[PDB]
Design a protein around this ligand. Structure first.
Ligand SMILES: *Cc1c(COP(=O)(O)O)cnc(C)c1O
Ligand SMILES: *Cc1c(COP(=O)(O)O)cnc(C)c1O
Lengths: 412, 412
């Protein structure tokens, strides 16, 4: 997203730092560029865990994406955002029966089961609710992807069910009288910057769909290719070749649609790739000090709002505001937040133009795994404002937190 | 705290897992044993950041402790808990002017300043409010403590002001007409398991008080010795010799009271030591699976409630509940929570009696840096119930979270 320093300075007169600022024009253009390159039989699904703000999620709903939820709470958020039931899928390795109950009662597109015991729970709830529950299976492939792993055969994971267990899973599936099997899901992990490994895993997932037809005579109605598209945060990281991924997977999916899967919905999921680059976290320098030969710059935001930046260094931009100093030589500094813990460090030993109280530190690539990934109540600071810029206007999409927010669960 | 397995099983019939259970009888006995060993001129202060539950904090208030707050939000919590202004101190390296304003308006015992610029902000606010503001200074000693650091002279830190800057700080202090200097504070860091290093730092802090009298003619009314008393979490860790710390520091403080400091309040702060061992985090096994030669046990709680256990392994106790299996051989397993991320791991490669759905996993030493240290809204799961056992009765001290708690700041 392009950062306008005068725009950000102006916003800090209207909104108290620290805040997240989202470029909604970039969000839309970035999504549409991805969409335009991708076979129309593939539907994109937003992973809500990457950002729990319903006003951002509503944008993707309006553009036709589905949403992937991982809890009954995220299911509620998805409905606040206006996603229809036919565009909601439910993942996760530890769904409680009460969560399965709400999912069955909601009639969502599918619950992606991660164990045989889960399948039987779903069946029991479908019977009690007099519904046909739609289920997919999350498969942990018996193959490792990329050109760097040592051992063949895939990796031990708490997620889903080993591919080697498919016969037992399909035997269970086909015995469930109130449950309809609709397909499969493979997800190889987040922050994947290896273009070829992504292509390989998605092709492998289409091929698993073929294998299920060959072995069981079932044509998957939904094949969820996962994704995990990474975003570069550090200088040594390179962006994915999104052109190569979209072209190669689109062609592989088209060949499947032309043969065995003419009415199958293919899904690519994304959280980070859709949102990370669209936001900046803006924080004001409160104090500057020297300690034992080092310089420390203390800012008004930190780990309780943006934990991921705390634990290399995120990309950052600096806005000089203080009107009295012109003493802006490059220096090595540590940028620390306001928390009473040495872990609250946005940047250690970072080489910046000299930062003084009133200057702004802007943390880039902050749109995913930001506020909701952080220990928001640690040390009792107010949760931050979030602002959405779009179509030339600015909209408050999250109010500043209050102390009453902290004690709500305690008084009650 | 002693864990009664039948008690915990009975509680899970009344309260939905996952939950925190606090032994309030242990909290009181553990505190009173510490108090009894300590010179009465030392007052203990609870560090609220270790646990933000006001019902626990109220216990310490009733026993006469002070409270150390690190934000205006924690100041509000301290007042909910009934701490009087004369028993509240305010620390932190990044206090906003709005936080300083509320602290001045509240007339608290002192604001512990961490920069000269902070001192001037406080003075300006005291003038505007027509109050005398009480301030202490946080000093970063020019000495390293223990018998393991290489370089002499102390360590670069974002906290407080280097001891070498004392003349400049005292020159600033003495120029503030609406602010009263009341003393000093040294805090060397959390989870300190080195008995002698604690004794050395506390003695050094008393000696700094003497140095301030010798150099400036000022008798500190408050000398805050900090603390950071650690608690052993892992098998290789040894408990502090609390007897040695309390006896040696009490004697050193008594010598100061008998000579130069007859009316000085000495403070020892504690969060972790007062609370860590008093709680268990109880979580139910939802699913069990094999993946690629390993066993995974998925529980209903995890990183979003108790991040510290996720990133060795905390001490854990296991309660067999499932009534059908007797297949309890020792096995190596990974215990994972319900979140859609491999980081949600309570125990990797841990050797336990075989765990089956319905069994309970109890994470010990969970009373400090627990719920409020965790990304409670990540993935949208309800925040957990907290229960206080005391005097033979059980009290709900935090209700289960709801989806409305997540969206409150977004709708509004
Ligand atoms: C985490 C998650 C996603 C989103 O991952 P990103 O790397 O943010 O795109 C997609 N699918 C599943 C199953 C997930 O758990
Ligand atoms: C963190 C903190 C404490 C509490 O530390 P514990 O190790 O939990 O006892 C005390 N004083 C200050 C200044 C702190 O920042």
């Amino acid at each position: 997203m392009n950062l306008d320093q005068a725009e950000i300075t102006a916003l800090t007169k209207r909104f108290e730092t620290p805040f997240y600022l989202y470029d909604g024009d970039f969000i839309e253009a970035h999504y549409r560029q991805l969409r335009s390159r991708t076979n129309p039989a593939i539907q994109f699904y937003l992973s809500l865990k990457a950002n729990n703000n319903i006003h951002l999620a509503k944008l993707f709903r309006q553009w036709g994406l589905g949403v992937e939820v991982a809890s009954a709470g995220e299911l509620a958020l998805a409905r606040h955002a206006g996603f229809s039931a036919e565009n909601i899928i439910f993942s996760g390795p530890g769904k409680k029966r009460s969560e399965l109950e709400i999912a069955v009662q909601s009639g969502i597109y599918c619950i992606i089961a991660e164990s045989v015991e889960e399948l039987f729970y779903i069946e029991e709830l479908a019977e009690k609710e007099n519904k046909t529950a739609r289920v997919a299976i999350r498969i942990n492939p018996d193959k490792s992807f990329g050109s760097t792993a040592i051992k063949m055969g895939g990796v031990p994971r708490q997620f889903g069910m080993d591919e080697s267990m498919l016969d037992a899973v399909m035997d269970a599936v086909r015995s469930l009288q109130f449950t309809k099997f609709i397909g499969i899901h493979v997800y190889t992990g987040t922050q994947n910057l290896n273009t070829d490994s992504i292509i390989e895993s998605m092709k492998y997932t289409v091929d698993l769909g073929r294998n299920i037809y060959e072995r069981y005579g079932i044509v998957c109605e939904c094949i969820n290719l996962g994704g995990g598209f990474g975003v570069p945060y550090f200088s040594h990281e390179k962006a994915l070749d999104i052109g190569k991924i979209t072209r190669t997977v689109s062609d592989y999916v088209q060949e499947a649609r032309d043969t065995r899967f003419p009415q199958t919905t293919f899904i690519i999921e994304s959280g980070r790739y859709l949102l990370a680059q669209a936001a900046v976290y803006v924080t004001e320098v409160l104090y500057r000090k020297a300690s034992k030969g080092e310089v420390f710059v203390i800012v008004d935001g930190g780990m309780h709002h943006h934990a991921a930046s705390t634990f290399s260094n995120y990309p950052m931009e600096y806005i000089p505001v203080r009107e009295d100093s012109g003493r802006r030589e490059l220096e090595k500094v540590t940028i620390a937040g306001p928390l009473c813990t040495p872990e609250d460090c946005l940047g250690k030993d970072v080489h910046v133009p000299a930062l003084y109280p009133g200057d702004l530190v802007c943390v880039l690539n902050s749109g995913a795994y930001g506020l909701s990934f952080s220990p928001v109540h640690f040390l009792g600071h107010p949760t931050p404002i979030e602002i959405l810029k779009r179509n030339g206007s600015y909209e408050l999409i999250r109010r500043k937190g209050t102390a009453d927010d902290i004690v709500a669960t305690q008084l009650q």
